[PDB]
Design an enzyme around this catalytic site. Structure first.
Site, PDB file in Angstrom:
ATOM      1  N   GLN A   9       0.800  -1.211   0.000  1.00 38.42           N
ATOM      2  CA  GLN A   9       0.000   0.000   0.000  1.00 38.42           C
ATOM      3  C   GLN A   9       0.836   1.266   0.000  1.00 38.42           C
ATOM      4  O   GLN A   9       0.268   2.358   0.028  1.00 38.42           O
ATOM      5  CB  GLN A   9      -0.926   0.015   1.209  1.00 38.42           C
ATOM      6  CG  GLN A   9      -2.091  -0.924   1.102  1.00 38.42           C
ATOM      7  CD  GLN A   9      -2.961  -0.884   2.333  1.00 38.42           C
ATOM      8  OE1 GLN A   9      -2.466  -0.748   3.449  1.00 38.42           O
ATOM      9  NE2 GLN A   9      -4.266  -0.995   2.138  1.00 38.42           N
ATOM     10  N   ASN A  10       2.157   1.161  -0.012  1.00 44.44           N
ATOM     11  CA  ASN A  10       2.982   2.354  -0.006  1.00 44.44           C
ATOM     12  C   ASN A  10       4.121   2.319  -1.001  1.00 44.44           C
ATOM     13  O   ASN A  10       4.716   3.368  -1.256  1.00 44.44           O
ATOM     14  CB  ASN A  10       3.547   2.591   1.389  1.00 44.44           C
ATOM     15  CG  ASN A  10       2.478   2.609   2.438  1.00 44.44           C
ATOM     16  OD1 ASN A  10       1.637   3.498   2.461  1.00 44.44           O
ATOM     17  ND2 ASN A  10       2.496   1.622   3.313  1.00 44.44           N
ATOM     18  N   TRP A  11       4.463   1.167  -1.548  1.00 49.72           N
ATOM     19  CA  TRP A  11       5.333   1.095  -2.706  1.00 49.72           C
ATOM     20  C   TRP A  11       4.508   1.353  -3.951  1.00 49.72           C
ATOM     21  O   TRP A  11       3.486   0.698  -4.166  1.00 49.72           O
ATOM     22  CB  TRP A  11       5.975  -0.283  -2.771  1.00 49.72           C
ATOM     23  CG  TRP A  11       6.519  -0.671  -4.085  1.00 49.72           C
ATOM     24  CD1 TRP A  11       5.843  -1.251  -5.103  1.00 49.72           C
ATOM     25  CD2 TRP A  11       7.873  -0.577  -4.505  1.00 49.72           C
ATOM     26  NE1 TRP A  11       6.684  -1.494  -6.152  1.00 49.72           N
ATOM     27  CE2 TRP A  11       7.942  -1.088  -5.804  1.00 49.72           C
ATOM     28  CE3 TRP A  11       9.034  -0.093  -3.912  1.00 49.72           C
ATOM     29  CZ2 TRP A  11       9.123  -1.131  -6.520  1.00 49.72           C
ATOM     30  CZ3 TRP A  11      10.203  -0.145  -4.619  1.00 49.72           C
ATOM     31  CH2 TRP A  11      10.241  -0.651  -5.909  1.00 49.72           C
ATOM     32  N   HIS A  44      -1.295   1.688  -6.544  1.00 44.34           N
ATOM     33  CA  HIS A  44      -2.147   1.337  -5.417  1.00 44.34           C
ATOM     34  C   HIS A  44      -3.480   2.048  -5.507  1.00 44.34           C
ATOM     35  O   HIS A  44      -4.536   1.419  -5.397  1.00 44.34           O
ATOM     36  CB  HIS A  44      -1.484   1.672  -4.093  1.00 44.34           C
ATOM     37  CG  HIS A  44      -2.427   1.620  -2.934  1.00 44.34           C
ATOM     38  ND1 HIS A  44      -2.686   2.709  -2.133  1.00 44.34           N
ATOM     39  CD2 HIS A  44      -3.180   0.607  -2.448  1.00 44.34           C
ATOM     40  CE1 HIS A  44      -3.552   2.367  -1.197  1.00 44.34           C
ATOM     41  NE2 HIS A  44      -3.867   1.097  -1.366  1.00 44.34           N
ATOM     42  N   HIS A  57       2.636  -8.845 -14.038  1.00 41.89           N
ATOM     43  CA  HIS A  57       4.069  -9.073 -13.895  1.00 41.89           C
ATOM     44  C   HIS A  57       4.554 -10.086 -14.915  1.00 41.89           C
ATOM     45  O   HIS A  57       5.569  -9.875 -15.589  1.00 41.89           O
ATOM     46  CB  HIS A  57       4.389  -9.551 -12.483  1.00 41.89           C
ATOM     47  CG  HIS A  57       4.439  -8.455 -11.472  1.00 41.89           C
ATOM     48  ND1 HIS A  57       5.079  -8.590 -10.261  1.00 41.89           N
ATOM     49  CD2 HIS A  57       3.925  -7.204 -11.489  1.00 41.89           C
ATOM     50  CE1 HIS A  57       4.958  -7.470  -9.576  1.00 41.89           C
ATOM     51  NE2 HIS A  57       4.262  -6.612 -10.299  1.00 41.89           N
TER      52      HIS A  57
HETATM   53  O1  LIG Z   1      -5.129  -1.951   2.295  1.00 42.84           O
HETATM   54  C1  LIG Z   1      -6.362  -2.301   2.025  1.00 42.84           C
HETATM   55  O2  LIG Z   1      -7.295  -1.523   2.052  1.00 42.84           O
HETATM   56  C2  LIG Z   1      -6.527  -3.761   1.678  1.00 42.84           C
HETATM   57  C3  LIG Z   1      -5.835  -4.191   0.376  1.00 42.84           C
HETATM   58  C4  LIG Z   1      -6.037  -3.157  -0.729  1.00 42.84           C
HETATM   59  C5  LIG Z   1      -5.293  -3.516  -2.009  1.00 42.84           C
HETATM   60  C6  LIG Z   1      -3.807  -3.667  -1.711  1.00 42.84           C
HETATM   61  C7  LIG Z   1      -2.936  -3.814  -2.938  1.00 42.84           C
HETATM   62  C8  LIG Z   1      -2.620  -2.714  -3.718  1.00 42.84           C
HETATM   63  C9  LIG Z   1      -1.707  -2.811  -4.750  1.00 42.84           C
HETATM   64  C10 LIG Z   1      -1.081  -4.019  -5.033  1.00 42.84           C
HETATM   65  C11 LIG Z   1      -0.010  -4.097  -6.044  1.00 42.84           C
HETATM   66  C12 LIG Z   1       0.372  -5.354  -6.587  1.00 42.84           C
HETATM   67  C13 LIG Z   1       1.402  -5.485  -7.445  1.00 42.84           C
HETATM   68  C14 LIG Z   1       2.126  -4.338  -7.821  1.00 42.84           C
HETATM   69  N1  LIG Z   1       3.182  -4.192  -8.613  1.00 42.84           N
HETATM   70  C15 LIG Z   1       3.479  -2.845  -8.584  1.00 42.84           C
HETATM   71  C16 LIG Z   1       4.875  -2.395  -8.787  1.00 42.84           C
HETATM   72  O3  LIG Z   1       5.183  -1.210  -8.692  1.00 42.84           O
HETATM   73  N2  LIG Z   1       5.760  -3.349  -9.068  1.00 42.84           N
HETATM   74  C17 LIG Z   1       5.949  -3.844 -10.423  1.00 42.84           C
HETATM   75  C18 LIG Z   1       6.866  -2.971 -11.243  1.00 42.84           C
HETATM   76  C19 LIG Z   1       6.493  -1.686 -11.602  1.00 42.84           C
HETATM   77  C20 LIG Z   1       7.309  -0.900 -12.395  1.00 42.84           C
HETATM   78  C21 LIG Z   1       8.520  -1.399 -12.838  1.00 42.84           C
HETATM   79  O4  LIG Z   1       9.334  -0.600 -13.660  1.00 42.84           O
HETATM   80  C22 LIG Z   1       9.763  -1.118 -14.811  1.00 42.84           C
HETATM   81  F1  LIG Z   1       9.972  -0.177 -15.717  1.00 42.84           F
HETATM   82  F2  LIG Z   1      10.906  -1.767 -14.654  1.00 42.84           F
HETATM   83  F3  LIG Z   1       8.891  -1.967 -15.329  1.00 42.84           F
HETATM   84  C23 LIG Z   1       8.916  -2.674 -12.476  1.00 42.84           C
HETATM   85  C24 LIG Z   1       8.089  -3.449 -11.685  1.00 42.84           C
HETATM   86  C25 LIG Z   1       2.600  -2.170  -7.782  1.00 42.84           C
HETATM   87  N3  LIG Z   1       1.739  -3.114  -7.292  1.00 42.84           N
HETATM   88  C26 LIG Z   1       0.681  -2.992  -6.420  1.00 42.84           C
HETATM   89  C27 LIG Z   1      -1.431  -5.132  -4.280  1.00 42.84           C
HETATM   90  C28 LIG Z   1      -2.346  -5.028  -3.250  1.00 42.84           C
HETATM   91  C29 LIG Z   1      -3.619  -4.789  -0.697  1.00 42.84           C
HETATM   92  C30 LIG Z   1      -4.345  -4.438   0.593  1.00 42.84           C
END
Ligand SMILES: O=C(O)C[C@H]1CC[C@H](c2ccc(-c3ccc4nc(C(=O)NCc5ccc(OC(F)(F)F)cc5)cn4c3)cc2)CC1
Ligand SMILES: O=C(O)C[C@H]1CC[C@@H](c2ccc(-c3ccc4nc(C(=O)NCc5ccc(OC(F)(F)F)cc5)cn4c3)cc2)CC1
EC number: 2.3.1.20
Lengths: 406, 406
Positions: free
Chosen positions: A300-302, A307, A340
């Site tokens: 939730q913060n990366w 997000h 991914h």
């Molecule tokens: O909190 C509540 O209310 C409960 C609940 C709510 C929902 C919550 C939740 C939210 C988000 C995700 C989730 C998942 C995957 C993900 N991946 C990315 C990511 O940034 N990484 C891949 C990447 C991006 C760019 C990159 O650059 C380049 F150029 F190299 F490609 C290379 C890799 C971001 N994500 C986010 C999951 C869950 C959970 C909790």
């Protein structure tokens, strides 16, 4: 008088001080001290070139020789198609289901087309292929949000029909759409909070950060990660669990440092430089994902944009249009895992299904770290979950691709 | 609604986030990952021995063969002398000037005696000599505060004579005095805030920290700092400015890391373990000296005990008993420089007067960093002032001693 209060030490496990901005300044100063000469040499070497002019000339003089920029440019047709569908159904044409299925067709096209191209064309570089797929998935998400926002505001105007800030229909201009396309966010919204000016100094600092960390990461890879593989160039697809883990334990730490530098170079330098070139103001690309005493707090913060996207276009809907928050969040993780895989495998024509497995195993991992550890101990547990964790999947893929080719 | 506020990025130079407790957990986890096996080997090797019993036996069976513990034990006579003088003048004997000059004689003895011994005895190790002088200067400061506190409370009782918490005279017991002697602080005070219990787990963690960082610092010295000198074993006392600085630039960074590990091993692990063995409660040994956007703020937060000592026994008096806060603070730095010199030179029989020069040049350095830099830029300036700065003086001394002997 009493000059000895009863308190506890700062670093101590339970004082709750947390004001360490100045540890990071130490990291900055040490990195500068330890790489400044080398970076100045590499800058005085490379930067004197004519990179933009020469690259645009060499491309424009003969296209189709780099199909990756060809494809990045071809994405504009899907962008314009979505714009046109919105503008047509803005006046009243294309009864809502028609526009909906036109959007769905457009989005499925945005997904399946670049994958098909990079899969059925051999003259494309894997890095260029990755960038093309990245642009296309960013475009997919942006246009998904575009559709939802326009639909919401249109139905709002419709309900109001039963009776400075920009209203609903007057926003559909090419400039507005493209501005949304190139803006560092995935959530479409009229009246993006603009920033007052450009701050040339800030811009220069960010470009210097990009160049610096680029050269530093090249160094990391060349001098720490490559030789560790060149010592034994054997793919993982054929190894056994023992040898796999024995190699991963030696590859982990440099991988983790490369990953951290990806983060800082992209989510804070690149996006800030962009949002500065085009005053965007918001600039909340990440919350404090480091001191995250959980996994569900890490995600939730990366990468904030993804997000808030998954929340207000994929989680909240499947809650109002359904139930079982467990099912909803599992769907979120499932979709992200598919993304991914689509992002890493397809550019390398592999299908080992590893990144999917990592993103999925996050769930039991999350429950594990939640049940067992707490506090700073939990934060250390999460750091472990990051060092071996997920960013080892991309490393396994790149390993089995590099040993097979060089 | 508005899902895009106008804000600024966390790492950004001016957000003012400052919640990075979790960067330090990363440092901890990386250090563990990178030295755990080696530390377990060294522990399973050394720790199985009978260190305390064997050392106490080998000492008690033949004293005078290590004059450094001899001297550390001999400090007890000055401790007891000050106790006795206080107890005598407590009842009324030794009219105040008599007790004052007896204390002054005792303190001058505490200073000049161990120096004379380590200077006129060749069979003593420089490390043991440094520890002896450290114990004696700690005792000097503690007894200075003892005298001042007893004098204050005695004159308070005297003025009251013109008419649970412990009152004035009933504190003069051997147990109380010795407790003050072994307590991690330099400011004497009745009714030290005790801690409830012992917290065996906390104690064990701190002992593990001590052992870990000890082995890690041995490693740093042996494998990074020694060979850099063994490549050219030539003393600084004979070099020229050019070669001096050319060597220092290569020696700086490892020196700085060794210094940081001294800090964390002593000011947070050792003192905490001590104050836990003997519930002391206070445990404010250091404030946030790192994120210190100045030098005068660095000194006021590195080594708290010495700071509050210099304040409420050497700065505030010379302000009430005088004026010119400039003169007072210069006197503070002068005395501290003399103490540094007495601490590093005498155990090595050198008199190059370098550490004095560094502590003194801090003043122009402080004005420099105050006039030029600000904010995080100022913090980086201070970090530079620490990397080359002061802790290079001790390094120059140890260098010119090591090349001359090994
Ligand atoms: O909190 C509540 O209310 C409960 C609940 C709510 C929902 C919550 C939740 C939210 C988000 C995700 C989730 C998942 C995957 C993900 N991946 C990315 C990511 O940034 N990484 C891949 C990447 C991006 C760019 C990159 O650059 C380049 F150029 F190299 F490609 C290379 C890799 C971001 N994500 C986010 C999951 C869950 C959970 C909790
Ligand atoms: O109020 C206002 O606004 C004004 C304000 C102005 C400035 C302020 C002031 C100035 C200077 C100092 C001061 C100077 C020097 C100094 N040295 C130490 C120290 O840490 N020693 C090194 C060491 C090394 C090794 C070691 O262990 C072992 F065993 F290795 F030896 C133990 C210690 C602590 N100091 C504190 C304090 C306060 C006064 C008022």
């Amino acid at each position: 008088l009493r000059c000895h209060r009863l308190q506890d030490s700062l670093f101590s496990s339970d004082s709750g001080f947390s004001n360490y901005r100045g540890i990071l300044n130490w990291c900055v100063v040490m990195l500068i001290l330890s790489n400044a000469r080398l970076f100045l040499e590499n800058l005085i070497k490379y930067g004197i070139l004519v990179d933009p002019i020469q690259v645009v000339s060499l491309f424009l003089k003969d296209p189709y020789s780099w199909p990756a920029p060809c494809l990045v440019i071809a994405a504009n047709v899907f962008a314009v198609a979505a714009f046109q569908v919105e503008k047509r159904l803005a006046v009243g044409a294309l009864t809502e289901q028609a526009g909906l299925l036109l959007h769905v067709a457009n989005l499925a096209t945005i997904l399946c087309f670049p994958a098909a191209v990079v899969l059925l064309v051999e003259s494309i570089t894997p890095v260029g292929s990755l960038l093309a797929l990245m642009a296309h998935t960013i475009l997919f998400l942006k246009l998904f949000s575009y559709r939802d926002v326009n639909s919401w505001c249109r139905r709002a105007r419709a309900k109001a029909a039963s009776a400075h800030t920009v209203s609903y229909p007057d926003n559909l201009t090419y400039r507005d759409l493209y501005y949304f396309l190139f803006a560092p966010t995935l959530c479409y919204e009229l009246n993006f909070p603009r920033s007052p000016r450009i701050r040339k100094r800030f811009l220069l600092r960010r470009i210097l950060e990009m160049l610096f960390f680029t050269q530093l990461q090249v160094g990391l890879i060349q001098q720490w990660m490559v030789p560790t593989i060149q010592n034994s160039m054997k793919p993982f697809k054929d190894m056994d669990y023992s040898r796999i883990i024995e190699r991963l334990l030696k590859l982990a730490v440099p991988n983790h440092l490369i990953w951290l530098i990806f983060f800082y170079w992209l989510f804070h330098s690149c996006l800030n430089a962009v949002a500065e070139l085009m005053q965007f103001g918001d600039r909340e690309f990440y919350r404090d994902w480091w001191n995250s005493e959980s996994v569900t707090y890490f995600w939730q913060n990366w990468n904030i944009p993804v997000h808030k996207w998954c929340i207000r276009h994929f989680y909240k809907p499947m809650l109002r249009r359904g139930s079982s928050k467990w099912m909803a969040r599992t769907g979120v993780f499932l979709a992200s895992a598919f993304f991914h895989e689509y992002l890493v495998s397809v550019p390398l024509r592999m299908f080992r299904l590893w990144a999917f497995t990592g993103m999925m195993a996050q769930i039991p991992l999350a429950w594990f770290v939640g049940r067992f550890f707490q506090g700073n101990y939990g934060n250390a547990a999460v750091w472990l979950s990051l060092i071996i964790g997920q960013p080892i999947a991309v490393l396994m893929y790149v390993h089995d691709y590099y040993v097979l080719n060089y």
